[PDB]
């Protein structure tokens, strides 16, 4: 009953948030076992960031230079090392709250929850999607660096994102928890451009299935379309071309609603050319692409008449 | 930068979530200290909730019927009770993960985070607004009865909502943590009239400031207007009348941007009158009333 953009419960991730201080720089860290993971730019100063030699700057830093706070308790840094763009600080105490975890690399189109933190304190949680241009449309401010993205699958927390920087366009950039950036970005103060952002069509189709499940059918029409002649409209409107694996992923939602995938593609084609003409789908005046088919199934779980 | 609908970190509330069972009925409970709060219809089954007598059903039940579970560990009931529409079950074990909390009753227009739960297990966290007609734009499935709505102030979790019934008409009904329903709803499964829904004007004007702070300012005009003139336009589009108390709250937002309260009213008046004609504000092609001035300040400060 109802459809909302929902984040995963953040509890398991809050128990891991710590504050990391290095000289004049303060950001957030993720305490898993006796290792703290944080953006490696923490070892820099604004001047360093113009062209930082992270290897040379990491030589000059010692275990004493890193101040880690888990609430009011201080943690002893007994070792340090760098892995791509992430700094790994080995602490003396293991985090008793370390959940069952794994470092995963999500694909563009996929969603995750973000826990925004300031000075090692959780502030809020929101659901995000990895845009096809490898940026996120988030809400982060000074001190948010080190804030993580994650999904929860049963008892396991899959960490997939760590916030590093904001791009001139207002969008955000970061790495997986192995330090590897998503997209063509670098942790260096240089002119950077996000790229062209296409709309995630598989997600838009999923959202239209969620709208039908919640009683919105004005957009449904007698017309049908082919996969090939839909991708032609998708080229004009900057929508991703629909692959066969994506059509199959929409199988369960198609089977439930009894609307064939290409009949939903015809409705999508019509909304692109003619527009919504004042009407709203799920109370939104625009087509939403930030819900994966799995997110729709998670809330719009219904029966299938085979 | 960027403006997102954010929910409060739900960790302090996840530690309070237990699975409450009574008869062949299973919902969620909120375990705070040695008391577990849950919707009183936990005593009822799929055949009692048409029009039941909750007073005579509470007499018929003893502490052996109620089985409170906190995950792997089981809780034993040491005294059932009832305040308004909520059921308070006393327990032997006090909740070790009980955070500093308070029970509040939110007013229409105010927001809170909902932690959705199924069989005592948390599923997702989303931010809701209490509509003027006392309804919530929620997402709840079966077994979500007893899911709570809250606000987090530093360490203090203010619990303001408990999910009771999903109306046949669609919308969701619930009480405060004292058991008093929000609006004209009862714990009986029947078609109940939600009411007339106005747009929360104070929340739209706060959202217009959030857009200005985040670089969106095409909607801004040189023009200005008085309360009496704006309140006339407010009636035409189903918008809440702007009170003088509504003006005082928007002060810090106005100070941060430079645009005075009455100046932003003149932009809203024009946006309602002409529309947007292709353009969007904060990535939305519609005006947003789900963000209080405090929610906008929370993110943009």
Author numbering:
A (entry chain A): 1 to 306
B (entry chain B): 1 to 301
Paper's wording?
The crystal structures of the Mpro mutants with the greatest reductions in susceptibility to nirmatrelvir were determined in the presence or absence of nirmatrelvir, including S144A, A173V, A173V+T304I, T21I+S144A+T304I, T21I+T304I, and L50F+T304I. The T21I+T304I and the L50F+T304I double-mutant Mpro apo crystal structures showed that the enzyme C terminus was bound at the catalytic site, presumably preventing nirmatrelvir from binding. The T304I mutation alone reduced nirmatrelvir susceptibility by 3.4-fold, while addition of T21I, L50F, or T135I each slightly further reduced nirmatrelvir sensitivity, resulting in 3.8- to 7.9-fold reduced susceptibilities. The double-mutant enzymes T21I+T304I, L50F+T304I, and T135I+T304I either had no impact on Ki or had a lower fold change, consistent with the lower fold resistance of the corresponding mutant viruses against nirmatrelvir in culture. The T21I+T304I virus acquired a nsp14 exonuclease I87V mutation, which existed in the T21I+S144A+T304I triple mutant that appeared in later passages, further supporting a stepwise selection. So far, the combination mutations with >5× in vitro EC50 increases identified in our in vitro studies are not represented in the GISAID database except for <10 instances of T21I+T304I of >13 million sequence entries analyzed.
